[PDB]
């Protein structure tokens, strides 16, 4: 469907070319992927050409331009709906009701998806275990600043830094502790050798901590629950013990959830949502109710969600905080107009139309974001996701694990670590060094950020310059914006703003530092009951 | 943990290893060639009730449970050159083995474990 192997050849290793594009015209499968596959093979034979022999080469430029303009058509020639399946993920402990009210918009407005909510049987103290280190280590650092803490101009930064280092130290004392237990020829529970850790270590009482985790069990179950582990997600070594040095070493959640979404949409195919995500607001709604030129169009957003919630009360306690500043008229104006009448209320998903090439995802500020996907099952691009997150984490475990097993505190183990990725580096894919230098403060520092680059949006932005690109195992390449559109989560379908989106349960910024830590030290001073 | 019954085999053959020490804990059979991961092969319930196999064998071999004399067995039938690898016993408190045919993150000690070639 390109130029013909005639037209090139009366345009213009090269056999190869002609005979590679020829293959290319003649196969007429119903395969995207084998089309895709072919377009691929001729594109590096038309590479190794133009390498080894740097007249041909102005006309086989014009055919690499059009086999990016064919990868497109592929794409754009056969969508079908995608299978009905809405994935959630919840590790780490008891689901809670906020979450499971969300879930319960999605699944009112679309009764024929399959809601899953993926969780780890063997996993329900993870959150309690990463509660007890972190609130030990700001007791300790606490402490120890006792003399300076008190002083208006502490930098909250100090705090932050010193209880790190009590953080690294008790997560190496618990992974020490489980290497040890899941070697014993009877190999426990994951839950088993937390809960004997946190009672010989923190005092824990064993029958709470018990009676907690049969109740998370209870719980999921009873609310579309689906076992990571039962049901064999995973099926390479490689992925689940990468899931698990996030479950386990780091306490990290958010990045344990991008590696088991990513193998649900392989395994099952549908649509991929993050607990905090609503279905999309009915268009045209909120034309009729004028919005004011006071109010930006984010937090308008963020209002539209406060009144529904107002007056139906699908979600209990939902924030009235943006909605309540203004206007009466407006209220009642928008009191009347949800009274009246949920499927006016929020769109319904009904077909989403996919190439089973690609994955779709949400926007946010012009960039990826991966809370919420769309994919039928086995597609090429999710494989392209898993394999630009395997690569990630194969060049951070290489230089983060001689830095990790050294008998070195954190501030020493940072340096090796950090020095390892700098002291002999390159530059090309050079910010992806700086990006993922503060992985071990994820989740517990301002500013950590690391996952974004490993498991999470960096890796579906170099997986969709891999696949316009016909590459594999791109880094730090990013595609221009008209290219990029091509895979967005349809915007109608789905309503980002939401209160509980608010707070990131894996990061915090600046602000949110600063307000804790001072939040710490008033309870700290002035005690509690 | 004690692996045993290993040897030679000729491809089409058969051969029945032991697993001897169990009875509330899932037993799960894997293996390792040379210069490959180690892979899951079969796995029994407590009761010996429940069986789960890897695919590549799955109808070929089975397990099954002699609780009486604390001892698992890996009845291998239709014997491949792939099957060639050194053979690892292990309990377990989950259900049908956990993660199986995965392994245990960070378990790197199965036991002694014992031969099987199938060769020529």
């Known amino acids: 469907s390109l130029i013909s192997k005639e037209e090139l050849i009366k345009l213009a290793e090269y056999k190869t070319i002609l005979t590679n594009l020829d293959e290319y015209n003649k196969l007429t499968t119903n395969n995207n992927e084998n089309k895709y596959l072919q377009l691929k093979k001729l594109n590096e034979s038309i590479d190794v050409f133009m390498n080894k022999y740097k007249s041909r080469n102005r006309a086989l430029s014009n055919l690499k331009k059009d086999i990016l303009k064919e990868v497109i058509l592929i794409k754009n020639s056969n969508t079908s709906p995608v299978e009905k399946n809405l994935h959630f993920v919840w590790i780490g402990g008891e689901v809670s009701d906020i979450a499971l009210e969300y879930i319960k918009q999605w699944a009112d407005i679309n009764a024929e998806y399959n809601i899953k909510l993926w969780y780890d049987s063997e996993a329900f103290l993870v959150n309690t275990l990463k509660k007890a280190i972190v609130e030990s280590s700001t007791t300790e650092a606490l402490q120890l600043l006792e003399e300076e803490i008190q002083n208006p101009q502490f930098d909250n930064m100090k705090f932050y830094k010193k209880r790190m280092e009590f953080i690294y130290d008790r997560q190496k004392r618990f992974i020490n502790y489980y290497a040890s237990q899941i070697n014993k020829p009877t190999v426990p529970t994951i839950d088993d050798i937390i809960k004997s850790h946190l009672v010989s270590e923190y005092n824990r009482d064993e029958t709470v901590l018990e009676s907690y985790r049969t109740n998370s069990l209870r719980k999921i179950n009873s609310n579309h629950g689906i076992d990571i582990r039962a049901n064999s997600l995973f099926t390479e070594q490689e992925l689940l013990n990468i899931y698990s040095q996030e479950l386990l070493n780091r306490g990290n959640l958010a990045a344990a959830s991008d590696i088991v979404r990513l193998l649900a949409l392989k395994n099952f195919g549908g649509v991929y949502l993050d607990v905090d995500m609503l279905p999309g607001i009915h268009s045209d709604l909120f034309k009729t109710i004028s919005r004011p030129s006071s109010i930006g169009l984010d937090r308008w957003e963020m209002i539209k969600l406060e009144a529904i919630m107002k007056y139906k009360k699908y979600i209990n306690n939902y924030t009235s905080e943006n909605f309540d500043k203004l206007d009466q008229q407006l209220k009642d104006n928008f009191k009347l107009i949800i009274e009246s009448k949920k499927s006016e209320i929020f769109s319904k998903l009904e077909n989403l139309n996919v190439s089973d090439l690609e994955i779709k995802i949400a926007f946010a500020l012009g960039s990826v974001i991966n809370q919420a996907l769309i994919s039928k099952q086995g597609s090429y691009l999710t494989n392209l996701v898993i394999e630009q997150v395997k690569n990630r984490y194969q060049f951070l475990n290489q230089h983060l694990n001689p830095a990790i097993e050294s008998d070195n505190n954190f501030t020493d183990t940072t340096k090796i670590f950090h020095d390892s990725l700098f002291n002999s580096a390159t530059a090309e894919n050079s910010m992806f060094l700086t990006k993922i230098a503060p992985y071990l403060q994820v989740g517990f520092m301002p500013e950590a950020r690391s996952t974004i680059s490993l498991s999470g949006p960096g890796a579906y932005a170099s997986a969709y310059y891999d696949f316009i690109n016909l590459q594999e195992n791109t880094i730090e390449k990013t595609l221009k914006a008209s290219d990029l559109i091509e895979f967005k989560f349809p915007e109608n379908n789905l309503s980002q703003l939401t209160e509980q989106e608010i707070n990131s349960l894996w990061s915090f910024d600046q602000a949110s530092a600063k307000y804790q830590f001072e939040k710490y030290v008033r309870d700290y001073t002035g005690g509690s009951l | 943990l004690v692996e045993s019954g290993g040897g030679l085999v000729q491809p089409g053959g058969s051969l029945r290893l032991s697993c001897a020490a169990?009875?509330?804990?899932?037993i799960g059979w894997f293996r390792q060639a040379p210069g490959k991961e180690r892979e899951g092969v079969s796995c029994?319930?407590?009761?010996?009730?429940?069986?789960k196999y890897a695919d590549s064998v799955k109808g070929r071999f089975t397990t099954s449970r002699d609780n009486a004399k604390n001892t698992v067995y890996l009845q291998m039938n239709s014997l491949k050159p792939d099957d060639t690898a050194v053979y690892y016993c292990?309990?377990?408190?989950?259900?049908?083995?956990?993660?199986?045919?995965?392994?245990?993150?960070?378990?790197?000690?199965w036991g002694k474990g014992t031969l099987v070639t199938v060769s020529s």
């Open positions: 029994i319930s407590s009761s010996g009730d429940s069986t």
């Open positions: 169990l009875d509330y804990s899932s």
């Open positions: 292990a309990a377990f408190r989950a259900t049908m083995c956990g993660v199986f045919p995965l392994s245990p993150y960070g378990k790197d000690d």
